[PDB]
Design a protein around this ligand. Structure first.
Ligand code: K
Ligand code: K
Ligand code: K
Ligand code: K
Ligand code: K
Ligand code: K
Ligand code: K
Ligand code: K
Ligand code: K
Ligand code: K
Ligand code: K
Ligand code: K
Ligand code: K
Ligand code: K
Ligand code: K
Ligand code: K
Ligand code: K
Ligand code: K
Ligand code: K
Ligand code: K
Ligand code: K
Ligand code: K
Ligand code: K
Ligand code: K
Ligand code: K
Ligand code: K
Ligand code: K
Ligand code: K
Ligand code: K
Ligand code: K
Ligand code: MG
Ligand code: MG
Ligand code: MG
Ligand code: MG
Ligand code: MG
Ligand code: MG
Ligand code: MG
Ligand code: MG
Ligand code: MG
Ligand code: MG
Ligand code: MG
Ligand code: MG
Ligand code: MG
Ligand code: MG
Ligand code: MG
Ligand code: MG
Ligand code: MG
Ligand code: MG
Ligand code: MG
Ligand code: MG
Ligand code: MG
Ligand code: MG
Ligand code: MG
Ligand code: MG
Ligand code: MG
Lengths: 50, 107, 87, 116, 133
RNA sequence: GAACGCCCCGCCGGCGGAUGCCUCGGCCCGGGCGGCGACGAAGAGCGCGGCGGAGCGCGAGACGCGGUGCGGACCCGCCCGCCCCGAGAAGCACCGACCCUCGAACGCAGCGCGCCCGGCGCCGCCGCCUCGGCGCCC
RNA sequence: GGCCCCGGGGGCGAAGGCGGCGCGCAGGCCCCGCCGGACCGGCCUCUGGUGCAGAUCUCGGCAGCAGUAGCGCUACUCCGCGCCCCGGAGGACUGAGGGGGAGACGGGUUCCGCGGCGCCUGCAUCUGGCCGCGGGUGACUCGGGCCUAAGCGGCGGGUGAAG
RNA sequence: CGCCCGGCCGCUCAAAAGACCUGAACCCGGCCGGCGCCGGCCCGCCGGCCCCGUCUCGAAACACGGACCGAGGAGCCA
RNA sequence: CGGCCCGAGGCGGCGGGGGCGACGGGCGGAACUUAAGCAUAUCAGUACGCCCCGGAGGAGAAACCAACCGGGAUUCCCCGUAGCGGCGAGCGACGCGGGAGGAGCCCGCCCCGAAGGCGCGCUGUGGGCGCCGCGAGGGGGCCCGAGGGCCCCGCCCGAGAGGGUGCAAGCCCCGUACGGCGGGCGAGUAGCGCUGCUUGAGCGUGCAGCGCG
């Protein structure tokens, strides 16, 4: 909606910011083979209830 | 549980050395027609038994005798058997390398 | 038309975010939480669901204060501090 | 590297308030350079060393301003749990009535030995 | 046979303690025997390995001697100078073959203020035991 | 007839993940312990790393700050930094502080507003200040 | 739990796998060759979550069927190295209750620029609401904050074993 | 390392163990051989042979369950 | 106009509120199930709902049990049939006896009256286990990618519990055995009548409402 409360805006803002890949130097640093962050989401198939 | 109880009464016995772990308790008749003619250990000594030897209730409690003022004697033999028991124990008591007595006193 | 067509009439929010438990369970029209019971002063807890009890309880969070108090008692100096005070 | 906490001990309040003003302003300069590198790590914790000392000198001053008062601020009261603050004192738990006491002095505790 | 009942003799717990050890325990567990020449001089049997010592290797397929360039405490291994993986090119860099400290014998020790003192601390306790016995 | 299909006289390839061996995990019994909170708990939200998503941790002093002891060469990548008879990396234990919004949750509301220039919630106990009554009296 | 005559068999190759002889009425057992790369037992006594073809059994893999059934909204073509993308020229459509221009609710970064084709775009792709990297929403006058509607809370107290 | 424009050759290693231990069955592709069970014969002829499990007086049944393969799967304890 | 009585607003110090899948205390309280049906009965004084503590809680120093040539507060362990019941299905205590543990006291009333905790009180105060640290003893020969393997000779042992180490290790490394620090006696009561629940309690086991007392 274009008319949203600041409290809903802030919780939506955090899901946008943390929706990221693992950095590549972290993959070298921590010696990882699983490289996908499975807590990511995509707007077409998500149901963020926030 | 057997080990726990043995450990508890070892610690208690040091804390009262050289007092024994038990009070001197009286000798009473087992109660029914089925069990009379034999004796067992009672709860405490009566004031008539204590009057025999010359101790007050507060005085006898101090040197290890259990005193039960609620009990009443039923006969004259009940008194003589327990006065003799009180008289004997006062002989084998010393009041201050000393011996602590184990188990029940005068079984 | 009680099936697929009826589902296209949904553009409402029944529940929103709770201020106490954070879940999508605060009824916007009754003003009550169906998860924790807010604005009730006590927490909603039922023994007919022990799985619901383990999901949110003591220990599933930080335990920030209770952690410090226990370690001070078990191995720190707190049992000494009571003897000075309780004298 | 950077400021030692020991070497701000002995400095006056003005010399610590004035030293904190430069540290705050310097982090503005270094955040501006970052967004427009080893030093910026040490500066964040120089700020924490100073504020650590400004607070530790202020608590020792106030805790003597109240040393002999009847009512003390709750920050300066002993460290105890909620249950401990509410317990009876050992003296309060050992109090006996007058008649009960005057009977415990009569008939003291005695050590004795019995024989087989 | 063990007598102390606060000490585990369970394989699962012992293996978990070899992993997940803190860093001060891992350093002690990476010890090696002193040579006979140093055993006479210092009157000590083993020492914790360290960056800067000279070691004689046996029992392995990479026997030799060299200085300790690195300590891989996570692996419990040490990299010695001159003991490398056989390389592909004639020019390319060396690659250290990592050695377990218990396959080594120390021939000369790195010394500083702390290492002199910890030796002397350890001799005085070993003389308390030699007076009790 | 050939080919397709089927069997295997044998030699090789796929697809799939059984079997065997392995185990920082579970389960059972026993022993300890029994230690939260208006001095703001349990729980929730948001934010914090030089390059930083998740989880652990921490709170605008934020991937930590100080003090006493101990320890004595490292700090998973790229860098920084430390290096020495003390100059001090990893690690450990106790102690002192910091401690944003919501929550028993406390000026009202839940994100917007006040009264007053310290501040400003409810109940109860003990005291104290100021008071009401054609209660009993004077 | 025991034994296995200088203290049972093992990298001079354990368990398992694939073929092939033998022994036993049989359940099954033993040996050899190849594979594999670290553990395994014969006899006596003890113990049990101890033997599968089926239960419209449970979980996992997977065949024939089979290159089979199948892929509303009038429509694209020529040239540009040319893709359904972009350009120019032509031919048509939606037809002002619009396949147009904008808000409310819901969604939550899908918006923009540059790059790109591993996934997706049930055909293709150089396209893209897909993937990577940077960015982006400015109010005395617009709305929210204020007022009250239908309602909903609160109220010395009242009631109920309590909630 | 080299050669062609992903492949080949080959390097590390005891070994590719190469995205990973071992790697069974069902099912499938290439080369080579041939045209259901029991019995006799060296071998494609002759002889015999209905689909199991189940309830049932009675099942090959036009009575029901079952495409195939693996692993799990039901009289123990007080 | 003051006192006492009964109330109101404010201020200060102190206390309460919430949290837990156990154990513990107080209330409300099922049905499936069994009876080869089903109403009493059973399941069960259980599930579940509400309230309240603690490190334990509850209980407790006889308005007790008995019938003896008698015991003697409470709790817990071992041991075993009176009885209830469509007298069906089912249900069910306890004393004596053997052990663990053992501990006893107060207020009201009465006497003295402020002797007290003194802005109160004569409508009655006061007295009668965990923290530290040392820690012994094996070589030579074949072989392997690698010796913890094979052959042959030894040492330590209060230590042959065990983990690691390139393949089965007392002697390669950490540990393991042997030790030091802190250390004169209670009233709307008891009882009784009627009614509801509960119990093995049977012309009443325990509780409760109302009337009486
Ligand atoms: K918007
Ligand atoms: K969505
Ligand atoms: K429909
Ligand atoms: K609700
Ligand atoms: K088909
Ligand atoms: K593009
Ligand atoms: K009531
Ligand atoms: K059947
Ligand atoms: K049938
Ligand atoms: K029939
Ligand atoms: K049949
Ligand atoms: K038929
Ligand atoms: K048929
Ligand atoms: K049939
Ligand atoms: K049929
Ligand atoms: K059939
Ligand atoms: K009930
Ligand atoms: K029922
Ligand atoms: K019924
Ligand atoms: K019934
Ligand atoms: K009945
Ligand atoms: K019943
Ligand atoms: K019956
Ligand atoms: K006893
Ligand atoms: K070794
Ligand atoms: K009365
Ligand atoms: K009554
Ligand atoms: K009954
Ligand atoms: K009866
Ligand atoms: K009545
Ligand atoms: Mg319907
Ligand atoms: Mg509605
Ligand atoms: Mg507490
Ligand atoms: Mg994070
Ligand atoms: Mg607030
Ligand atoms: Mg088993
Ligand atoms: Mg079975
Ligand atoms: Mg099967
Ligand atoms: Mg038209
Ligand atoms: Mg776009
Ligand atoms: Mg496509
Ligand atoms: Mg306006
Ligand atoms: Mg494989
Ligand atoms: Mg039938
Ligand atoms: Mg049928
Ligand atoms: Mg079928
Ligand atoms: Mg099976
Ligand atoms: Mg107040
Ligand atoms: Mg049942
Ligand atoms: Mg029935
Ligand atoms: Mg039936
Ligand atoms: Mg029925
Ligand atoms: Mg019953
Ligand atoms: Mg109690
Ligand atoms: Mg009943």
């Amino acid at each position: 909606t274009a008319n949203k409360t600041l409290s809903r805006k802030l919780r939506l803002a955090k899901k946008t910011k943390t929706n990221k890949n693992i950095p590549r130097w972290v993959i070298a640093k921590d010696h990882l083979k699983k490289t996908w962050n499975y807590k990511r989401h995509h707007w077409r198939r998500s149901h963020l209830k926030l | 549980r057997k080990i726990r109880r043995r450990q508890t009464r070892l610690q208690k016995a040091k804390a009262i050395f050289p007092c024994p772990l038990q009070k001197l308790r009286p000798s009473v008749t087992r109660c029914s027609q089925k069990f009379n003619l034999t004796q067992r250990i009672g709860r405490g000594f009566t004031l008539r038994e204590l009057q025999g030897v010359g101790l007050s209730a507060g005085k006898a409690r101090q040197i290890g005798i259990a005193v039960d003022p609620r009990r009443k004697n039923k006969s004259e033999e009940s008194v003589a058997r327990n006065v003799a028991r009180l008289k004997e124990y006062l002989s084998k008591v010393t009041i201050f390398q000393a011996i602590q007595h184990q188990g029940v006193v005068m079984p | 038309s009680k099936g697929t067509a009826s589902f296209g009439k949904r553009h409402t929010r029944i529940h929103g975010s709770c201020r106490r438990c954070g879940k999508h369970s605060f009824h916007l029209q009754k003003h009550e939480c169906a998860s924790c019971g807010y604005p009730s002063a006590k927490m909603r807890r039922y023994n007919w669901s022990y799985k619901s009890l383990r999901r949110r309880t003591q220990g599933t969070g930080s335990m920030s204060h209770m952690r410090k108090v226990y370690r001070a008692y078990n191995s720190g100096t707190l049992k000494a501090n009571a003897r000075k005070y309780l004298a | 590297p950077g400021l030692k906490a020991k070497d701000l001990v002995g400095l006056s309040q003005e010399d610590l308030q004035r030293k904190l003003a430069d540290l705050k302003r310097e982090l503005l300069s270094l955040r501006t350079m970052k967004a427009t590198i080893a030093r910026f790590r040490v500066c964040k914790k120089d700020v924490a060393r100073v504020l650590t000392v400004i607070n530790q000198k202020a608590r020792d001053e106030a805790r003597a301003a109240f040393e002999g008062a009847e009512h003390i601020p709750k920050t300066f009261r002993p460290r105890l749990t909620h249950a401990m603050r509410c317990q009876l004192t050992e003296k309060q738990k050992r109090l006996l009535p007058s008649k009960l006491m005057k009977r415990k002095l009569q008939f003291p505790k005695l050590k004795y030995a019995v024989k087989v | 046979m063990k007598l102390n009942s606060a000490v585990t003799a369970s394989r699962r717990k012992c293996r978990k303690a070899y992993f997940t050890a803190n860093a001060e325990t891992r350093a002690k567990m990476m010890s090696s025997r002193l040579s006979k020449e140093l055993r006479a001089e210092h009157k000590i049997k083993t020492m914790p390995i360290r960056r800067g010592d000279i070691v004689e290797i046996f029992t392995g397929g990479h026997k030799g001697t060299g200085k300790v360039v690195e300590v891989r405490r996570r692996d419990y291994k040490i990299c010695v100078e001159g003991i490398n993986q056989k390389a592909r090119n004639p020019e390319a860099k060396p690659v250290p073959y990592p050695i377990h400290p218990s396959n080594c014998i120390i021939k000369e020790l790195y010394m500083n203020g702390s290492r002199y003192r910890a030796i002397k601390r350890r001799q005085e306790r070993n003389a308390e035991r030699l007076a009790r016995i």
